[PDB]
Structure to design on (1003 residues):
């Protein structure tokens, strides 16, 4: 273990001292391994073309031998395995003696070979090698599969090992790219403009989350990492850009678990002249279309407890179920919330109800946080298939425009799948007087110890004073999306280098 | 000014008390203003279709009147202006009295109109309105153009005003999107995989830069914002992904100027089995092709001192000039650097030369920092057209692989345009023993006061011990790219919300 590594360092020193090949700068492949398979994969068993010499390269996944004169390698690159048959009778002695040449090679090494193409008598796609070059040695003994790792968390702390050994991990990251391409194309075809707004913020806002804090030394100013881009993106609608979207990181200085990483990838879009009804229709079309693209059906498997456990079929057939936020809580409770929803009376009542149904109390006990606890217990748990929870109270929705019909409510929805939040969207609040009021209430909750409440943002209020058109806005958690698309129950599966404890 | 804002708040309260329209939730347009222009722009002068009622919306850019009975608006939306002709004869009195309705509207307001399509007798594309709705008022008196702003830095502190008033700013951000689309497509067509790596780092590295520092409260751990993604991206090549790219923010806790913002957008790619010669050829093909796409030619204007100043024509015709880093310094100096380049003798000599040619001394006076100063003076200043500076010394290049031929050098290049760095690239160092050594030397320089030197990254060394294939890697500053493409001399022009004092 420890000894293998030291020996390998010693081998490489020896190789260098001996003037043998030591980390060559450039190896010129004749073609990729996939291209090789495509060209030679259909030749007859035992076919060899001694009139073509080719150079191939990959990582060694196997070493076997029949004699001191015949060695069999597998190399892997770009999802393709090719066998190398090294017969001493073909060995170019100018590269060294056969046994010396091959004694420098171990499983896990990145290597190059030259030789003649064809297929073994047994029908294996092969190169009949004349030489081998060590390009980049592996200094550690590898397992042949992830099951051989000391523990499965090595897959995340040393992701290169997972990628090396585990086709399923590679497929996830390819599916993620494909899904994001689909999403961009959806909006590009609607005439959206992709934008980038600051990740360093003088004032954080646009979500309910605790921020990361930092400091710009030259400008002598505290900054926050953005929890969301919303407050910048809306300024672009004031600016008249009409349809904008942004895809990138949010930073939330919070705990980690199966559906939470301190940095995650979100998409937000803002569309002038849309309301939240329009946004519900768009969400259905975008997401059902992506599901159909990936899976070939709107009904897809999900394994909450891993692949040998129970399977639920998630059905994305549109239109999706709607749950009215307050009404469904009241159905669950068998009684009504007190009005107004943010009165001390309703706070007291919601505390009683949390205690009665054994729901963990939030801190502080704001109306907003209590409502969220009750929603989490009574409503989110009904959202197995994609379901919209709609019409959130204003008290928990400071950037959402008041509901045109329903007192105390807003024109907001969240999309939930398997009980987890995927999207958050609303008819945007564009009336500066109440916006300012709602910011002041947020700053009061923050001063009372609500670490998820944001400070007042005057620059945003001033922007609203220049006239935000009627607008609909929307956010999607891309990591969580990939979790459902790829049937993973742990966000660490869909992020290359996720946060880990010590 | 101050009074206009208060009065507007008072108007809105009155409107609301009177039960008139107050921030309607939804206005259903019949079509976009561009679509309207396309459909009605070629009717004969004076044409009106009283059989079609349409709803249009935009921001009011103009209000004129010939009487108490006839008002002319311009509304602007989605790059299209349409004239609205409001004649009292057509006014739907159910929406209120004409004069009341129109008295609520000011220039800058977002509004809706309904009416009949056609064209004024003078040939102006118009809507003959029957009604108006105030959708979102502007509470501030606006200029009609950016020249009317109290000063031009309002354009950056209040970017919505620039976008509102200034077609040129809107065009820049559209060009930026188009350029990034072109770049993604170039690599997607090569079979690259786009990836995302952490912006929050236990250890920062992959560039020469001072980081932002933060803290994760739950894990009780200091973190750094990434200065570059390089050290993660290389691990993905160890992992066998073969061809990866990432486009996103870097964070560098430094001064701001015409070509520096504390957050900026960079692309990095890593390509197994490529070397820096391969990367030079790729750079030429990608960049020249993008220039040709945007401009229709490989020769483009640049105005270093603004649009009334001198103009330089930048020529992207390939292949581009190469300047060998050390040899060009020596040409400039008229004498040779002392060897080894990191010896005390060469440090002393480079200090003398900086003093002789009036180059500001760096602190600390490392070989790397001195070499950079001399390159900045003697080499970068020769790079008007896209030019590669190649073969940087190892001492200033801790992640670049040793040059296969030239001692003390590496297989590195930077791309310079108009004296500014656009790209940085190399044959990647994949030999863990030296890599560790060069990290240790960086950490020594850091301890001796080099605020741009990075700490040792053990996890990266361990990753190298699992075998990084021969690899070529590359970085591009997207903001700077847009500066040349769009002929801007200030990075604040190409970033929506740039840092300000
Ligand atoms: O995908 C997530 N949520 C869905 C959205 O809320 C939808 C609207 C746009 C923002 C994200 C998500 C993923 C995380 O890792 C995470 C981590 C956190 O510490 C806090 C919230 C988080 O939320
Ligand atoms: O585009 C830039 N430089 C070119 C690259 O070095 C090429 C290689 C990939 C990274 C960027 C650039 C833009 C900035 O605003 C900036 C700000 C800083 O405080 C420091 C460096 C910066 O550099
Ligand atoms: N900023 C929101 C998403 C968009 C809501 C609609 N403006 C979030 O992070 O939850
Ligand atoms: N990490 C480099 C760019 C890539 C260099 C080649 N690996 C920088 O920020 O300058």
């Amino acid at each position: 273990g420890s000894h293998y590594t030291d020996n390998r360092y010693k081998m490489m020193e020896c190789i260098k001292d001996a003037g043998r090949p030591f980390y060559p700068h450039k190896f010129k492949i004749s073609m990729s391994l996939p291209a090789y398979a495509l060209k030679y994969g259909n030749v007859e068993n035992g076919y060899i073309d001694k009139d073509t010499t080719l150079s191939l390269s990959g990582r060694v996944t196997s070493i076997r031998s029949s004699s001191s004169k015949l060695i069999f390698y597998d190399i892997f690159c770009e999802e393709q395995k090719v066998q190398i048959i090294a017969n001493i009778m073909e060995h170019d002695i100018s590269t060294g003696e056969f046994s010396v040449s091959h004694s420098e090679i171990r499983r896990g090494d990145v290597v190059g070979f030259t030789g003649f193409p064809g297929k073994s008598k047994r029908g294996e796609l092969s190169l009949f090698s004349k030489s081998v070059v060590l390009l980049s040695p592996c200094y550690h003994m590898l397992p042949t599969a992830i099951s051989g790792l000391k523990d499965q968390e090595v897959r995340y702390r040393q992701r290169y090992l997972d990628l090396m050994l585990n086709e399923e991990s590679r497929k996830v990251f390819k599916l993620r790219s494909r899904a994001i391409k689909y999403i961009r194309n959806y909006f590009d075809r609607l005439g959206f403009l992709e934008v980038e707004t600051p990740m360093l913020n003088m004032i954080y806002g646009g979500a309910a989350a605790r921020p990361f804090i930092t400091y710009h030394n030259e400008l002598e100013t505290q900054l926050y990492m953005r929890i969301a881009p919303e407050l910048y993106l809306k300024q672009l609608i004031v600016g008249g850009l009409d349809k904008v979207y942004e895809i990138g990181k949010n930073f939330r200085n919070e705990g980690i678990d199966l559906t939470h990483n301190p940095e995650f990838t979100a998409m937000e879009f803002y569309m002038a002249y849309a309301d939240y009804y329009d946004l519900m229709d768009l969400t259905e079309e975008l997401i059902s279309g992506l599901v159909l693209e990936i899976h070939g059906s709107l009904k897809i498997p999900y394994h909450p407890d891993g692949p040998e456990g129970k399977c639920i079929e998630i059905d994305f057939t549109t239109p999706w179920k709607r749950f009215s936020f307050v009404e469904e809580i009241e159905s669950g409770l068998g009684e009504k919330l007190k009005r107004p929803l943010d009165s001390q009376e309703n706070i007291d009542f919601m505390v009683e109800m949390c205690e009665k149904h054994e729901i963990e109390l939030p801190h502080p006990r704001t109306a907003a946080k209590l409502l969220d606890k009750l929603a989490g217990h009574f409503v989110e748990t009904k959202c197995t298939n994609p379901s919209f929870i709609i019409d959130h109270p204003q008290t928990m929705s400071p950037l959402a425009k008041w509901h045109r019909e329903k007192p105390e409510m807003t024109e907001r929805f969240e999309l939930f799948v398997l009980g987890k939040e995927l999207c958050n969207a609303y008819t945007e609040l564009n009336e500066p007087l109440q916006q300012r009021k709602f910011f002041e209430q947020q700053a009061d909750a923050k001063a009372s110890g609500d670490v998820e409440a944001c400070p007042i943002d005057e620059t945003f209020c001033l922007a609203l004073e220049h006239g935000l058109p009627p607008t609909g806005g929307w956010g999607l958690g891309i990591d969580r999306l990939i979790m459902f698309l790829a049937d993973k129950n742990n966000i660490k599966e869909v992020i290359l280098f996720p946060a880990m404890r010590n």
Remarks:
- Chain B touches chain A through 102 residues (CB under 8 Å).
